Amino acid sequence: MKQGLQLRLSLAMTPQLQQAIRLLQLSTLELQQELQQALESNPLLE
Amino acid sequence: MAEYKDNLLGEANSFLEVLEQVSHLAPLDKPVLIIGERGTGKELIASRLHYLSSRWQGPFISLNCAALNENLLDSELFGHEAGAFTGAQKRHPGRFERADGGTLFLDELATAPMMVQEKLLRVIEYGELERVGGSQPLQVNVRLVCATNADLPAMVNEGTFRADLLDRLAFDVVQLPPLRERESDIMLMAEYFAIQMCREIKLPLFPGFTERARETLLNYRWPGNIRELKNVVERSVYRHGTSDYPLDDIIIDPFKRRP
Amino acid sequence: AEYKDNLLGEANSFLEVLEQVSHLAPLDKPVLIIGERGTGKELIASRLHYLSSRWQGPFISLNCAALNENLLDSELFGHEAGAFTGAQKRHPGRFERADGGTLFLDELATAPMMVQEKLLRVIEYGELERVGGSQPLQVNVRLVCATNADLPAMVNEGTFRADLLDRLAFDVVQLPPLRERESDIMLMAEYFAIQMCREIKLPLFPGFTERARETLLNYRWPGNIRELKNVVERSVYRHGTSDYPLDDIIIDPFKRR
Amino acid sequence: KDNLLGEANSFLEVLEQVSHLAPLDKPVLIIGERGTGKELIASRLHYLSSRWQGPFISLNCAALNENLLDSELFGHEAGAFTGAQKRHPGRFERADGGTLFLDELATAPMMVQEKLLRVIEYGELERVGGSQPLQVNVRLVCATNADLPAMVNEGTFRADLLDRLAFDVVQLPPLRERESDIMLMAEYFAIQMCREIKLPLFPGFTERARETLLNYRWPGNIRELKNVVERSVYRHGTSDYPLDDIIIDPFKRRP
Amino acid sequence: KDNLLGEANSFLEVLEQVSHLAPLDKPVLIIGERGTGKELIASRLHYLSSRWQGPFISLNCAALNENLLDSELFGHEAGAFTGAQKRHPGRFERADGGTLFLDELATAPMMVQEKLLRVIEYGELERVGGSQPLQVNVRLVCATNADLPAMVNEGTFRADLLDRLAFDVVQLPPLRERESDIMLMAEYFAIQMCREIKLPLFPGFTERARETLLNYRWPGNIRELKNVVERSVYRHGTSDYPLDDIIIDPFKRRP
Amino acid sequence: DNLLGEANSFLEVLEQVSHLAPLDKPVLIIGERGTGKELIASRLHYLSSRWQGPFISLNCAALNENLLDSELFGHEAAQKRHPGRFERADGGTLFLDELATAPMMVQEKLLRVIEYGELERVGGSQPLQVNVRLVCATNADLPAMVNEGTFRADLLDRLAFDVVQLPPLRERESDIMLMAEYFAIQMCREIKLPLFPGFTERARETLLNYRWPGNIRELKNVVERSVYRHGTSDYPLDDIIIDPFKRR
Amino acid sequence: ELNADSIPRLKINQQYAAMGNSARNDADGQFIRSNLQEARWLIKSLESRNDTLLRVSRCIVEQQQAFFEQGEEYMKPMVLADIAQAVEMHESTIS
Ligand SMILES: Nc1ncnc2c1ncn2[C@@H]1O[C@H](COP(=O)(O)OP(=O)(O)O)[C@@H](O)[C@H]1O
Ligand SMILES: Nc1ncnc2c1ncn2[C@@H]1O[C@H](COP(=O)(O)OP(=O)(O)O)[C@@H](O)[C@H]1O
Ligand SMILES: Nc1ncnc2c1ncn2[C@@H]1O[C@H](COP(=O)(O)OP(=O)(O)O)[C@@H](O)[C@H]1O
Ligand SMILES: Nc1ncnc2c1ncn2[C@@H]1O[C@H](COP(=O)(O)OP(=O)(O)O)[C@@H](O)[C@H]1O
Ligand SMILES: Nc1ncnc2c1ncn2[C@@H]1O[C@H](COP(=O)(O)OP(=O)(O)O)[C@@H](O)[C@H]1O
Ligand SMILES: [Mg+2]
Ligand SMILES: [Mg+2]
Ligand SMILES: [Mg+2]
Ligand SMILES: [Mg+2]
Ligand SMILES: [Mg+2]
């Protein structure tokens, strides 16, 4: 509408973490294998 | 190199010579300006010019002239490189930028903003333009197509149209034969429109036109060159019955008072 | 689908209008409805769209007059992708509604001259109103118009272009005046009274007094349906428990005491 | 250098004045003369100047938008809007010492004139909320097709805008006034058009008709008058056709 | 330190009044014709003021539009505001303790005047998301060419605010009104240009040039003198041949 | 606490203002380019139980409507809990200035704040009702201007129970000479002047032939201009600085 | 509703978190903090993926109720963009 600039207040590049999260939800039974694989590496998750 | 004659109708008058002149001027890529009949026929002239232009020459970019009050029009004409100009913050190409090597079918809307015409003067100055917030200018090439519906010299004298706007444009003027002046293919164009309307309505047979209808059409002013006549034919077909006694009953237009 | 003509006008003029609408329903062209304030024009257009061969997909009766700005109406006709920022609604949806459908507008005289020119340019080509950085889409859409103001009056005013007025006006539907219609008015009033007695779930229908009916007929009632429904509601609020035929008209909120 | 010249005594005097003013980076307001002042001449003058070695660049004054004029002076500002976050310099700052040729000067807004003349006369490159403005001495020159004193009498242009000019307003003679190389210029334009019209040469020509066509109003521009030759050549479309009995009146309807 | 082009008895009185003006940051207003250059004299006085080494603000007011004080004047150091995440400086805030000269404050928005009313009345008004602002120690200065006496009568500015904006307003006499030392200024400009144009020496002005300068209207006053100097640079001719007369007119035809 | 010229009508008005000061009712004030009751408003806040209470005085002209509700306790999407307009003024004096030229959106917000409305912003769903004593001033617009449709009628109804009338400086100027002398002494201390050389009684009477459009502001400006013109304290001044915007 | 048995669930090791918080070795504490951050990101991602799948399924059912009830014959012609429109996610998230 009327031309202007920012006069009041109101995105993201998902990295490898959120990128693999998006790469997740591909399957469920297969997702369990990857989750077990991650839980093996992560020592603070049960 | 294709015909694409389309619905090129009403050439029995000197419009055949106008089409010959248009064909002669078609190879040139210089500025193209016309004077369409007020109310009808400018779109047909533009389509004929586009057919005259090579099909592979480029896209036929058509814009209806508008004032500069809408900043969107300014972004379309000059471009939009910086943010908050048009589209995304990136270099969203404008309408002029959208046309690269194609026809720029201008409209003689006689828009109130002379500033818009002044900006368009730079659009065709050396074949270059700069987007809104454009860090570097861009030299572009495109064909130009224009038309008219009023007396350009009258506006030039009255100051309604910029003198430089007329000077830069209008390499040659193409005049459309008026409906009150053409008057030649009225029977032929009327028959073509009637056939098309009958096909659309799935009419079993051609109803035919009485001689009184032809006399009335001759007496008719016909403000629109090829659209008002077609609209009148459609209205008559709506109020008539094909190959039946209702064929005599012809309706000029619903705007006219009912019989 | 099938046209709905509930409480159709008993006047033969309404029947002739319906016959013309049925004749034009197989056809696909714009229509102009010469209506009045609350005359019932838009409902007639909706009924025609129901009778307009198939159901004709989406049917939208958006009015440019009842819009905050002409720019909003233009955005409804077509929204350029990425133009400005944010919106009250998905503007391209209004354009998509006409796709596989028709175009219906109310009080078209209020449309801006630039908006009217954009619409005239769209209608001849059929393409989308806003390019949005891409070639506009030619959706197969019909059209319909309904303005109380006279088209020749607009032409004299010059707000609408000659081509706009000509190509826009393909069919004319002159709504009979509500005050002029009497038998149709009585039939519609009886139908509305029955429908209200059913919907309000009143155990017994009060009916209508002869004096009350005469007074209702004496009223100008420009709103053939809108004012009729308002008066029906005014009488219903003064619920007489099927025993009071006074039918007091409290439709005017300003009127009191 | 590359641009063709009028090759006239008045044209020679104008070229000499341009050469004298070439080393000067001061503002110029050479009269646009309503289409008769070849912008290519100004480009060649900038080429002669050291601004050719610098970043010489021009722009149209009236091209900018009303709400972005401050941006137009200073480019894209980093804090102007949420999306763009970069202190992009202005077009003048994109030149920053080059030759800035101002076109559409008479069409600039009153507020635009008040901002631009004030900034140019004195002031440094200050963006939206900048820390410290940066002074960039950029060579300037302007064009005005109309009479600036007429605007001053009308008051449309500011007196500061009148003083913004630092060099003498070079004015080109009108096509009716100059009319000196009309034969040679017409021959050059005809050769260029024949090359453009894929015509090797014109077997028919008439110098008397060319002189008669020179004896015309030639309104709009001298280049506009030359375009009449191209229009006539295109209409004829033939080589063995003398220039005699040939008049280019595209606006006029033929009988 | 402070180079001065004006050496006159009225100029001497004005300079003494400048000496009579101390760094009180009072709402004094320097009034002069177009090209008066009184802003330079005000900057020189600010250098001579208590803040011998202090900040100075040019602050071309015409560049401000649709922007509050916290946009460029006060600044937006607060984050998460309108736009991206950053902290912006403020010209008025950064100028605290220095000089805040208003460039052509006559051409200002009505809302700008409304804000400046409180800004000058209190001195601690604006804040980008702040509760209590801090009073600025800057020195308020201003200079333009319009006559506020009629603008206030016309309602262009708030009479109460303008009166509060006026404390020791001083009007500089025009150079045309002065009509003295024009020859000395011309000689100084000739020397400066000969240095600039690398000329051997000033050609010299005869009695005809002196009479023309005396008879010159000089509506621009000091601006007219600068324009005449630029023209004489253009009209330098030969150093050996003294310039009998030197004239300039933007619309004067060459013949 | 507050220093001003004293007049009998002004003394009675000040006494009434002090009496109303302990009351926390909303205040709507009209000024005449003099003290403008801003000093009177501060003295009222000091005399009230809100002496230690907040005395936020917002000059409502420089804000942007896009954040107007943000100013009046509005926060949205990183840092939150920003002090609102009423929140920062809660528990004490809440003064509004520059009300003559405020936007109509500000008028609607004030109408909402008349019943104290509520501030359900993303930063906080506060019910407002801070109960702090409201006060309004800078009513440059005449009552006819309000009747001219400039402001909402409800806001005028929502205004204070009474109106603070201000008389012109021309109406009462008996102590104007004393105030001018005090201002001259203050400026001499500020200008590091040795001492006041005095004033000419004939020149004082000549200067008295004025309407004082700026009232105390005009008196102070005239005194400052005359002192600057004198530039010395050898002999008493015998001239009047009629106007800085006067040709000479 | 999502199948409760089928949905995987992760729990943060409270003993490990307590040990890392009170870890005497600074390097061990930093490693524990990094592992906790990674695990929290993974858990949040898994929960968000499950919730998004549930919402997408609900939206799909809203429009496919006709095929669900009447049968395969009353299947509405639907596209990926059709489902994407009813939700705030993109067609890529739909895929
Ligand atoms: N031979 C023809 N072929 C196709 N269309 C024609 C022909 N003759 C007339 N027309 C019609 O005449 C109309 C001219 O309209 P147009 O010139 O665009 O109106 P305006 O001049 O008012 O802008 C077109 O819509 C076109 O359908
Ligand atoms: N023939 C009819 N039978 C039953 N109801 C009708 C008829 N014509 C109009 N109405 C009623 O009149 C009401 C208003 O119609 P209309 O005036 O066309 O709408 P709008 O206010 O959009 O113009 C509708 O709700 C409709 O139910
Ligand atoms: N000597 C020349 N030779 C060829 N073309 C010229 C010559 N002088 C001007 N032109 C043409 O004139 C056009 C520019 O017009 P110009 O005189 O610059 O208008 P304005 O005076 O408004 O700037 C250019 O496109 C250029 O081709
Ligand atoms: N004291 C002075 N001595 C010599 N030249 C001066 C003096 N003051 C101003 N000028 C001339 O005035 C011009 C700039 O004036 P300007 O700053 O536009 O006046 P204003 O203060 O009215 O804006 C300079 O080119 C300069 O040559
Ligand atoms: N009784 C007084 N004692 C001391 N100073 C006063 C008195 N009355 C007015 N003034 C001075 O007059 C000035 C008027 O300022 P302000 O209240 O902003 O005026 P306005 O009400 O027009 O906005 C103040 O700065 C103040 O110093
Ligand atoms: Mg309606
Ligand atoms: Mg048209
Ligand atoms: Mg030009
Ligand atoms: Mg100046
Ligand atoms: Mg005040």
Short mmCIF file of all heavy atoms in Angstrom, two decimals, chain F residues 80-103, unseen atoms left out:
data_model
loop_
_atom_site.label_atom_id
_atom_site.label_comp_id
_atom_site.label_asym_id
_atom_site.label_seq_id
_atom_site.Cartn_x
_atom_site.Cartn_y
_atom_site.Cartn_z
N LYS F 80 10.75 -8.33 27.28
CA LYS F 80 9.38 -8.07 27.69
C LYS F 80 9.39 -7.22 28.96
O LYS F 80 10.43 -6.75 29.41
CB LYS F 80 8.61 -9.38 27.93
N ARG F 81 8.19 -7.03 29.52
CA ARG F 81 7.98 -6.26 30.74
C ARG F 81 8.47 -4.82 30.64
O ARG F 81 8.94 -4.26 31.63
CB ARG F 81 8.63 -6.95 31.95
N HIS F 82 8.37 -4.22 29.46
CA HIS F 82 8.73 -2.82 29.32
C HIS F 82 7.75 -1.95 30.11
O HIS F 82 6.54 -2.20 30.08
CB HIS F 82 8.74 -2.41 27.85
N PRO F 83 8.24 -0.93 30.82
CA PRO F 83 7.32 -0.09 31.60
C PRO F 83 6.36 0.67 30.70
O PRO F 83 6.77 1.39 29.79
CB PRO F 83 8.27 0.85 32.35
N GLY F 84 5.07 0.51 30.98
CA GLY F 84 4.06 1.17 30.18
C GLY F 84 3.91 2.64 30.53
O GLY F 84 4.51 3.15 31.47
N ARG F 85 3.09 3.33 29.73
CA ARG F 85 2.84 4.74 29.97
C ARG F 85 2.21 4.96 31.34
O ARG F 85 2.69 5.78 32.13
CB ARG F 85 1.95 5.31 28.87
N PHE F 86 1.14 4.23 31.64
CA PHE F 86 0.52 4.34 32.95
C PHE F 86 1.33 3.59 34.00
O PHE F 86 1.38 4.00 35.17
CB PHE F 86 -0.91 3.81 32.91
N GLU F 87 1.97 2.48 33.61
CA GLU F 87 2.77 1.69 34.53
C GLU F 87 3.95 2.50 35.08
O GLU F 87 4.22 2.48 36.29
CB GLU F 87 3.27 0.42 33.84
N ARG F 88 4.65 3.21 34.20
CA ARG F 88 5.73 4.08 34.65
C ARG F 88 5.21 5.24 35.49
O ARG F 88 5.93 5.73 36.36
CB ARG F 88 6.51 4.62 33.45
N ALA F 89 3.97 5.68 35.25
CA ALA F 89 3.35 6.75 36.02
C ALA F 89 2.47 6.23 37.14
O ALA F 89 1.83 7.04 37.83
CB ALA F 89 2.53 7.65 35.10
N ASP F 90 2.42 4.92 37.35
CA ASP F 90 1.55 4.35 38.37
C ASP F 90 2.00 4.78 39.77
O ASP F 90 3.19 4.89 40.05
CB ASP F 90 1.54 2.83 38.27
N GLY F 91 1.02 5.02 40.64
CA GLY F 91 1.29 5.41 42.01
C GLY F 91 1.58 6.87 42.23
O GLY F 91 1.91 7.25 43.36
N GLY F 92 1.47 7.71 41.20
CA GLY F 92 1.75 9.12 41.36
C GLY F 92 1.12 10.00 40.30
O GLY F 92 0.03 9.70 39.80
N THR F 93 1.80 11.10 39.96
CA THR F 93 1.28 12.01 38.96
C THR F 93 1.50 11.46 37.56
O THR F 93 2.61 11.03 37.21
CB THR F 93 1.94 13.38 39.09
N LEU F 94 0.45 11.46 36.75
CA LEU F 94 0.49 11.02 35.36
C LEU F 94 0.04 12.20 34.50
O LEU F 94 -1.15 12.40 34.29
CB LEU F 94 -0.39 9.79 35.14
N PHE F 95 1.01 12.98 34.02
CA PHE F 95 0.72 14.21 33.30
C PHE F 95 0.80 13.98 31.79
O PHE F 95 1.69 13.28 31.31
CB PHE F 95 1.69 15.31 33.71
N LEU F 96 -0.14 14.57 31.06
CA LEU F 96 -0.18 14.50 29.61
C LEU F 96 -0.01 15.91 29.05
O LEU F 96 -0.68 16.85 29.50
CB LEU F 96 -1.49 13.89 29.12
N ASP F 97 0.90 16.06 28.09
CA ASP F 97 1.18 17.33 27.45
C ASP F 97 1.18 17.14 25.93
O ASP F 97 1.11 16.01 25.43
CB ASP F 97 2.52 17.90 27.91
N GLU F 98 1.25 18.26 25.22
CA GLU F 98 1.18 18.27 23.76
C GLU F 98 -0.12 17.62 23.27
O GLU F 98 -0.18 17.02 22.20
CB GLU F 98 2.40 17.60 23.13
N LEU F 99 -1.17 17.76 24.09
CA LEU F 99 -2.46 17.16 23.79
C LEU F 99 -3.22 17.90 22.70
O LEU F 99 -4.16 17.34 22.13
CB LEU F 99 -3.31 17.11 25.06
N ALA F 100 -2.85 19.16 22.42
CA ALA F 100 -3.55 19.92 21.40
C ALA F 100 -3.38 19.30 20.02
O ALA F 100 -4.33 19.25 19.23
CB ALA F 100 -3.05 21.37 21.40
N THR F 101 -2.18 18.80 19.71
CA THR F 101 -1.87 18.25 18.40
C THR F 101 -1.65 16.74 18.44
O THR F 101 -0.79 16.22 17.73
CB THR F 101 -0.65 18.95 17.81
N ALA F 102 -2.42 16.03 19.26
CA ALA F 102 -2.27 14.58 19.28
C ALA F 102 -3.14 13.93 18.22
O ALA F 102 -4.11 14.53 17.75
CB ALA F 102 -2.64 14.03 20.66
N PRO F 103 -2.81 12.71 17.81
CA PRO F 103 -3.63 12.02 16.80
C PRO F 103 -4.94 11.54 17.38
O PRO F 103 -5.10 11.39 18.60
CB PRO F 103 -2.75 10.85 16.37
#
